[PDB]
Subunit: 169 residues, 4 copies
């Protein structure tokens, strides 16, 4: 459990990348007409959601849901609002195996939205057991032990403004 944290992706680099992500997302949904909603997966994506939605120059709603912790994907907390006939962008902190988002996307698809897309801050292509389409990615990283920016290690470092790496001593 003895460890330390070094900066891997500085605060400024994250901010710059999200600014670009915001422009990409804006470019795709600004000429839609239908209502838009960003859905965050609690509670690793709350900080990413906050910064991202501010860089999205399109009128949209902000909703959250909480999925399960091989076991099934259960919904601890569902969305507060409806998504039928809307443009839905799922906002996740990091995707590895892609199990959770795969199931979450299926569940949300049943409610028949106009479109359904996924935006992630971090991506680990190495670990991947279920191929799930991801349209917006902030950073592609190797299978490293990362924390910060909503991402935790034993419920710690969630509040770090940067993405850091954990070094096991």
């Amino acid at each position: 459990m003895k460890h330390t944290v070094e900066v891997m992706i500085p605060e400024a680099e994250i901010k710059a990348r999200i600014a670009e992500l915001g422009r990409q997302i804006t470019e795709r949904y600004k000429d839609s007409g239908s209502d838009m909603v960003l859905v965050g997966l609690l509670r690793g994506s709350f900080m990413f959601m906050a910064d991202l939605c501010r860089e999205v120059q399109v009128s949209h709603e902000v909703d959250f849901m909480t999925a399960s912790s091989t076991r099934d994907v259960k919904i601890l907390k569902d969305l507060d609002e409806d998504i039928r006939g809307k443009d839905v962008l799922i906002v996740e902190d990091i995707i590895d195996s892609g199990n959770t988002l795969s199931k979450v996307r299926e569940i949300l698809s049943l409610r028949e939205p106009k479109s359904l897309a996924i935006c992630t801050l971090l991506d680990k292509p190495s670990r991947r057991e279920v191929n799930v389409p991801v349209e917006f990615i902030g950073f592609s990283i190797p299978d490293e032990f990362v924390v910060g920016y909503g991402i935790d290690y034993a419920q710690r470092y969630r509040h770090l403004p940067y993405i850091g790496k954990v070094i096991l001593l």
Copy 2:
């Protein structure tokens, strides 16, 4: 809420006998399955029906519950406690009219890939069906009347009635 009266539509004795029959049918279907079985009830209206039905199901199974919402999207207010993957799942509902809600609930549970998936409802109002949903076990197919009792409510009332009654307004 308006002035009304509750008249018996399905007496307590008729329900007990019918659930006993339903029990034998469900038992005969999943007795040679071998795989784990679970009865899933949809709160709140199905709590009484579930209690009596599972006591008539003579196979080793599990009892779980979930709460769904409502043209609105069917949202999960309370999910299952256990996994249904590779298990015989029997959804237990109090009454079907539109079939919108139950259709969606079956779709969600199907995503978790159970061995088999089926529905058992106590009451059925086929004259209100808007979506074709396959129901395998039906206690009573009833006429288009607002029923109460046996878990079913009217303004959160009459859930504790041991029989199925119908609400008749005073006009």
Copy 3:
């Protein structure tokens, strides 16, 4: 894990006891005037709730909530309806240490109901770490390994019409 189940409290004995419980509860709340509600603690009390509320000859509502699994008592699912200014009777399958009901009663008390009472099917006085007032008890039993009537063993025997004892082989 190898075991077997013998009948401890037969179906008829439970039914007779609940009939008496129903009369007691009816006698206390029939001259109240205020609305009444039976609150069941999922999912061990669903069968007891079904039989009990049918023996209560007073107009009441039926609601359910799901508490936590030393850790804190968390609410996985809250009540659907309000209890403010109402007569509330908490319905539990079995009470031992009395930790959960103690916390649940505190939480419900904050919503300021007219009265707040607890009805349990089984009671284990031996195991008890928090003294919580219980007005209606179906059976007082020694610290035995019991199942059935909503009470489970590894998610099993919940559907038994009788209270049985587990014999570890």
Copy 4:
């Protein structure tokens, strides 16, 4: 919803500076505690405020969320994920007017016996207070106007605004 206009009440720069200040105050309070700390946000309106605030809190803490309802009873739609027993708990709210909801939420969390319990709100409308609830950290005390932005909505709108604005109808 009616025809309206959104005018800036608290610019983005003013919020960033104020949250920075709030951060230093919170840091100085719990730095010598030693016991674990957790910031509890009340969804949904507080997600943005939480994200910026916890980044300014220079002590090792945890971030958790909960969702409460609403004269109705305050019900828990989504409870905390972690335990708060023996921990410094700081509730993080977007705005206080009546104070009914937050009063009840504090009561529920107090039952779990944390080491300490405190409240930090971004906005405050003391001219709407109906219940005396002790708030220790306040970003802005604002006049009686319907504000939007920074997590706060109007018919599920304007949550994504980086500033605090006010809705003005067209009459």
